[PDB]
Design a protein around this ligand. Structure first.
Ligand SMILES: CC(C)CCC[C@@H](C)CCC[C@@H](C)CCC[C@@H](C)CCOC[C@@H](CO)OCC[C@H](C)CCC[C@H](C)CCC[C@H](C)CCCC(C)C
Ligand SMILES: CC(C)CCC[C@@H](C)CCC[C@@H](C)CCC[C@@H](C)CCOC[C@@H](CO)OCC[C@H](C)CCC[C@H](C)CCC[C@H](C)CCCC(C)C
Ligand SMILES: CC(C)CCC[C@@H](C)CCC[C@@H](C)CCC[C@@H](C)CCOC[C@@H](CO)OCC[C@H](C)CCC[C@H](C)CCC[C@H](C)CCCC(C)C
Ligand SMILES: CC(C)CCC[C@@H](C)CCC[C@@H](C)CCC[C@@H](C)CCOC[C@@H](CO)OCC[C@H](C)CCC[C@H](C)CCC[C@H](C)CCCC(C)C
Ligand SMILES: CC(C)CCC[C@@H](C)CCC[C@@H](C)CCC[C@@H](C)CCOC[C@@H](CO)OCC[C@H](C)CCC[C@H](C)CCC[C@H](C)CCCC(C)C
Ligand SMILES: CC(C)CCC[C@@H](C)CCC[C@@H](C)CCC[C@@H](C)CCOC[C@@H](CO)OCC[C@H](C)CCC[C@H](C)CCC[C@H](C)CCCC(C)C
Ligand SMILES: *C/C=C(C)/C=C/C=C(C)/C=C/C1=C(C)CCCC1(C)C
Ligand SMILES: *C/C=C(C)/C=C/C=C(C)/C=C/C1=C(C)CCCC1(C)C
Ligand SMILES: *C/C=C(C)/C=C/C=C(C)/C=C/C1=C(C)CCCC1(C)C
Ligand SMILES: CCCCCCCCCCCCCCC
Ligand SMILES: CCCCCCCCCCCCCCC
Ligand SMILES: CCCCCCCCCCCCCCC
Ligand SMILES: CCCCCCCCCCCCCC
Ligand SMILES: CCCCCCCCCCCCCC
Ligand SMILES: CCCCCCCCCCCCCC
Ligand SMILES: CCCCCCCCCCCCC
Ligand SMILES: CCCCCCCCCCCCC
Ligand SMILES: CCCCCCCCCCCCC
Ligand SMILES: CCCCCCCCCCC
Ligand SMILES: CCCCCCCCCCC
Ligand SMILES: CCCCCCCCCCC
Ligand SMILES: CCCCCCCCCCC
Ligand SMILES: CCCCCCCCCC
Ligand SMILES: CCCCCCCCCC
Ligand SMILES: CCCCCCCCCC
Ligand SMILES: CCCCCCCCC
Ligand SMILES: CCCCCCCCC
Ligand SMILES: CCCCCCCCC
Ligand SMILES: CCCCCCCC
Ligand SMILES: CCCCCCCC
Ligand SMILES: CCCCCCCC
Ligand SMILES: CCCCCCCC
Ligand SMILES: CCCCCCCC
Ligand SMILES: CCCCCCCC
Ligand SMILES: CCCCCCCC
Ligand SMILES: CCCCCCCC
Ligand SMILES: CCCCCCCC
Lengths: 231, 231, 231
């Protein structure tokens, strides 16, 4: 395990996701409100899935070698397995907060699936120049998602409770900033142009992942917006 | 890319799915009705997914070699990845049109999953005679789906709005004819008996795919059946 | 096929799932009640999926070799493909019976996904001692599911119809006993410590699978709890 310099960040990531999972699990024990239960379920599952995939990367299972540029390049494929399930759960948290219509939710989840799926294909593609074609398609799917979060959701939040409108606005802003960093790190890291070494890349993704999951969850689950308006 | 004679049909397929995706995306921009949004979301996602998988076939990612009959046989596995997601979306379009009950929808999607999954296993099976066992099981799942579309849905459409009944009937008929061709092409093509060469097989699937997705979508999204009855 | 001593149990399993599938399919033909249709759909799909995966194991497709302990160890990976889809369907049968809230259903299905997914990783892991780390995480996800079935569902059933409360209690008890045997068989069988040989392991899983699917389904589909209260 320690044979890879990036192991320290995989281990820290595993620990922080594990701790985040346990914290949300305990916190949600005292919850009976049916609406709050939905948000706790979604939000606890996110770091639990990430915990398993960080562990698989730490132990070496979630790593494969991909030939491109005349080299055997270490590619952590387990990231995409994580993201396939956790990024639509994160979007679902946002969509339920603002009572999004079903068509909009399906558009978001579908675009998200395309985003992660094409990122996976790009990560595993052996023809170097083609990796960036997949990156571009994935990034276009991301831009669609960000567009919807701003010009379909923000003006939906404003007709809702003030506490859900303010909580949505904060989580929207956190999401757009954090999620936009992922394609940049991929592009300059070992999957793309290879300018930033894998150990630093792994650190960067770990900070983004913990912030986008445990950070996000801490903000959401401390808000009164997750509860039905009750006396 | 041009090293494979079937590349021209993969390229045309990619282009037509891409163009179809953009057309539906633009067309649905001016839509606020919650019901119509569902149909636009579902129907736009279908060629978008197909676009990505056609591209993966064009670039060579979605192709593998399978030993059977003492030969290395080129198998485009990306078709099944496409179909796994797009065929239940197509069925969902039909089921929502007639306000199908939840049990019926689950039966359809489940049978569809079995249909595509067993087709994939058959496509990748190395014992030649066993490929046709999987083809038979998949075809039985197809026949179940077609049965339900006729003797569970058609008489559901007739108690609904005339515009939804007439639109459903047309899309049902398009679906049954087009979908029934797929097992025949598989059986006589490079996956099955090998009587029709891969380049012609690829052409045939491209015509079926564009018709079943973009053709289907053009009929559906031009109907007033996708809108709630409103003043 | 007969080259593997466990083939007889794979063949019997295939037959019993096939027969169970046909029986439930015929039985549900005379059903119009929308609630009952849901239970028939879910419950018929379960042995149908299991039939396909038992067949893939019989024909040899669903088997791979995994190096650990200095040996090539036969691992039937198709079990996890089965279980990935059938165990959440089984939980859905239980959850719908007691009209579980959406948050609880998502927690169950999510924990179940983690349970099966980590079992799959453990089954395919090449470092022997690490296989048991994945077994432990999977078992913890199982224990969560069993906890919810007892201390979240049982007291939900009691405020419902007596026929649904009594049917739920029986199916809950069947589920907890049968499902708890699976991690034990894995641990002592060819995936784990290797004390029980593969042919006996295969027998054990076949008895558990038929009981947990066809047995379970026979109890559920003969109950009046699956019908809406109607005059
Ligand atoms: C009911 O609605 C609220 C339940 O949501 C909360 C439900 C949770 C989503 C349940 C899912 C967590 C499972 C219990 C997962 C089990 C293994 C976990 C990964 C635990 C890992 C952390 C520990 C090992 C440090
Ligand atoms: C509604 C939304 C969910 C829409 C989803 C959007 C989605 C369509 C976007 C594209 C997804 C698609 C790229 C998934 C591809 C998975 C694939 C990378 C798995 C690895 O297999 C690739 C090659 C080795 O590189 O296998 C070597 C050759 C092997 C023989 C491969 C044969 C097995 C195939 C992988 C079977 C395909 C199954 C499905 C792709 C399962 C989807 C997995 C998940 C990653 C989407
Ligand atoms: C809101 O409900 C309506 C939105 O549906 C319409 C929503 C669409 C389903 C959004 C999904 C499309 C994504 C934007 C996919 C991005 C890449 C596409 C494959 C674009 C490819 C076509 C172009 C490259 C020729
Ligand atoms: C409700 C509905 C959805 C019901 C669904 C119906 C469904 C049950 C029908 C059968 C689906 C099942 C056949 C999927 C099999 C996928 C498999 C072909 C992927 C390729 O792996 C096959 C061999 C190489 O040929 O791998 C070589 C050996 C490797 C070590 C394989 C180990 C990895 C396994 C593939 C893990 C299994 C994961 C699940 C099958 C994911 C499902 C993928 C999708 C195609 C259904
Ligand atoms: C409508 O709601 C009730 C339908 O549920 C019942 C619907 C069923 C879930 C339909 C799914 C079964 C498909 C017809 C599967 C076809 C192949 C089967 C595996 C048949 C195998 C058994 C036989 C070959 C012995
Ligand atoms: C809401 C709930 C559903 C939550 C779900 C919980 C879930 C997160 C729990 C963990 C699931 C995760 C372990 C699935 C891993 C599948 C993996 C074993 C498939 C086989 O690939 C493993 C190695 C060979 O051993 O591939 C060799 C290297 C290859 C290059 C691998 C590259 C292809 C990757 C497999 C692509 C990943 C796609 C997704 C994992 C699809 C999920 C399949 C299913 C088994 C969950
Ligand atoms: C918890 C993990 C999260 C929130 C991950 C988010 C990841 C993305 C938004 C990834 C986006 C990518 C692209 C837009 C193109 C390049 C490849 C990706 C997959 C890194
Ligand atoms: C957009 C793509 C569509 C509508 C594809 C439909 C495909 C089928 C109905 C495929 C059916 C098959 C069988 C019935 C058995 C042989 C294998 C298949 C998968 C080709
Ligand atoms: C129809 C099949 C059923 C009901 C299978 C149930 C399987 C399980 C509950 C498996 C549990 C496992 C663990 C808890 C850890 C070890 C690995 C598994 C996957 C066997
Ligand atoms: C969105 C953030 C992307 C920028 C990442 C900056 C990383 C700077 C680290 C120094 C680069 C290491 C190069 C020498 C090894
Ligand atoms: C459902 C349509 C299946 C029939 C396809 C007919 C294809 C005819 C093309 C000629 C066959 C090529 C054989 C000589 C290369
Ligand atoms: C939950 C049941 C697990 C116990 C399984 C008992 C199997 C006993 C069979 C005898 C073991 C075979 C060892 C000699 C080959
Ligand atoms: C490819 C995996 C996509 C599914 C991820 C799980 C999250 C799905 C959330 C469903 C949202 C509800 C839509 C109506
Ligand atoms: C194996 C992939 C199956 C899922 C495909 C996505 C479409 C699912 C549509 C869900 C229909 C709603 C059922 C209640
Ligand atoms: C990884 C596969 C998980 C999906 C299995 C299919 C069963 C899903 C049942 C959905 C229950 C409804 C939740 C709201
Ligand atoms: C186009 C929608 C406006 C809100 C999205 C902001 C786009 C940020 C760009 C992210 C950088 C990705 C490379
Ligand atoms: C049995 C249901 C009647 C409607 C379905 C028509 C079946 C068409 C056969 C398709 C050919 C597949 C090989
Ligand atoms: C902790 C919840 C109480 C009900 C679950 C009973 C646990 C049975 C243990 C199963 C054995 C697995 C190794
Ligand atoms: C070796 C790099 C070749 C450049 C490929 C860039 C493709 C980016 C596509 C953006 C439309
Ligand atoms: C080499 C071909 C052997 C014939 C197999 C046909 C099987 C079809 C099954 C239909 C019930
Ligand atoms: C396994 C193929 C089944 C096709 C005939 C339909 C059987 C009746 C089902 C009624 C829902
Ligand atoms: C070779 C076996 C080494 C023992 C591993 C047991 C790990 C079990 C983890 C339970 C917390
Ligand atoms: C509760 C702490 C969980 C941390 C387990 C994984 C950390 C890796 C240590 C090497
Ligand atoms: C908008 C046109 C999209 C076409 C891109 C793929 C066509 C392949 C050209 C070689
Ligand atoms: C209807 C009987 C189904 C049995 C088919 C599979 C049994 C395997 C026989 C070798
Ligand atoms: C993006 C950083 C999130 C910070 C989380 C802090 C949570 C405290 C309530
Ligand atoms: C099956 C062929 C479909 C033809 C689509 C034409 C759409 C025009 C409205
Ligand atoms: C766990 C054993 C189940 C027994 C099923 C018998 C069904 C008869 C109604
Ligand atoms: C990591 C366990 C958290 C302890 C409880 C925190 C207050 C709910
Ligand atoms: C008003 C919300 C500001 C949140 C910005 C957080 C940036 C990481
Ligand atoms: C809305 C601001 C987006 C900031 C992008 C930051 C990418 C590192
Ligand atoms: C391909 C872009 C379509 C242009 C608009 C067509 C009329 C909505
Ligand atoms: C009355 C609907 C006829 C549609 C037939 C289309 C055949 C491709
Ligand atoms: C309902 C008519 C089906 C026609 C099947 C055509 C197959 C090529
Ligand atoms: C296996 C076929 C079952 C025959 C009908 C049983 C009574 C519904
Ligand atoms: C009162 C229900 C008892 C069911 C026990 C079944 C054990 C297999
Ligand atoms: C509730 C009793 C569980 C029995 C476990 C049996 C495991 C073989």
């Amino acid at each position: 395990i320690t044979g890879r310099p990036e192991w320290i960040w995989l281990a820290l990531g595993t620990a922080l996701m594990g701790l985040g999972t346990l914290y949300f699990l305990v916190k949600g024990m005292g919850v009976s409100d049916p609406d709050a239960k939905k948000f706790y379920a979604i939000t606890t599952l996110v770091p639990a899935i990430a915990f398993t995939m960080y562990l698989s990367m730490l132990l070496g299972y979630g790593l494969t070698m991909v030939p491109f540029g005349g080299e055997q390049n270490p590619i952590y494929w387990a990231r995409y397995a994580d993201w396939l399930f956790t990024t639509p759960l994160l979007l679902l948290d946002l969509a339920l907060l603002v009572d999004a219509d079903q068509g909009t939710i399906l558009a978001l989840v579908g675009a998200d699936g395309i985003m992660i799926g094409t990122g996976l294909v790009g990560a595993l593609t052996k023809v170097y120049s083609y990796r960036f074609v997949w990156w571009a398609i994935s990034t276009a799917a991301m831009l669609y998602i960000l567009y919807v979060l701003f010009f379909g959701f923000t003006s939906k939040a404003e007709s809702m409770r003030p506490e859900v409108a303010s909580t949505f606005k904060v989580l929207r802003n956190v999401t757009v900033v954090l999620w936009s960093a992922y394609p940049v790190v991929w592009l300059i890291g070992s999957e793309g142009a290879g300018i930033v070494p894998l150990n630093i890349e792994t650190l960067l993704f770990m900070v983004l992942d913990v912030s986008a999951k445990v950070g996000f969850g801490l903000i959401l689950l401390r808000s009164r917006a997750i509860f039905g308006e009750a006396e």
